[PDB]
Design a protein around this ligand. Structure first.
Ligand SMILES: [Cu+2]
Length: 186
């Protein structure tokens, strides 16, 4: 159980920024995407480390229909479905070369990570996330059990607002985490 801490995923960030003030009506105006998320299902944030599927068998495309990538294909009864929403999600500023930092409290290890980034021209404020919209920019091999895992990726030919989609395949069983992070390539 865990998530990408940097660049923070959607639900981790929503928890981090608003967990201490989750019913604040001004969230609507300060962080509208976090607002809609908290409105829909507070557990998307309280259980921020739980965005996984079991028994995907490597078939990520089958498990995650277009427009449901960020929710893990509506995993856990749609718990994270608000992650699929379209709009001005808060971004982390990154360079074209950036570090992914995963935290996993259970130290499951990883068989691999896949890192996809949206193509130039994609607009996350108006368009749902699709497999077409993403290109694979990084692939790792396995990592031993550890609470913190990090590695550097390069996402070429990108500028401004994008989505980084990280697939983390745990080593303890066929459990796969699906981690969307909003970024701004500066
Ligand atoms: Cu776990």
């Amino acid at each position: 159980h865990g998530s990408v801490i940097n660049p923070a995923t959607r639900n981790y960030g929503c928890w981090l920024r608003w967990g201490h003030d989750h019913l604040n009506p001004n969230m609507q105006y300060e962080d509208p995407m976090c607002w809609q998320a908290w409105q829909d299902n507070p557990n998307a944030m309280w259980n921020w480390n739980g965005l996984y599927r079991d028994w995907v068998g490597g078939n990520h495309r089958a498990a995650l229909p277009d427009g449901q990538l960020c929710s893990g294909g509506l995993t856990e009864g749609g718990r994270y479905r608000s992650m699929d929403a379209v709009g001005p999600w808060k971004t982390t500023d990154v360079n074209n070369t950036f570090t992914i930092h995963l935290y996993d409290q259970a130290s499951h290890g990883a068989d691999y990570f896949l890192v996809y980034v949206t193509k130039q021209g994609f607009d996350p404020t108006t368009q749902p996330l699709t497999w077409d919209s993403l290109e694979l920019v990084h692939q790792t091999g396995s990592y031993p059990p550890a609470q913190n895992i990090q590695f550097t990726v390069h996402a070429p030919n990108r500028s401004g607002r994008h989505v980084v989609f990280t697939i983390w395949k745990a080593s303890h069983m066929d459990q796969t985490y699906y981690l969307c992070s909003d970024v701004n390539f500066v």
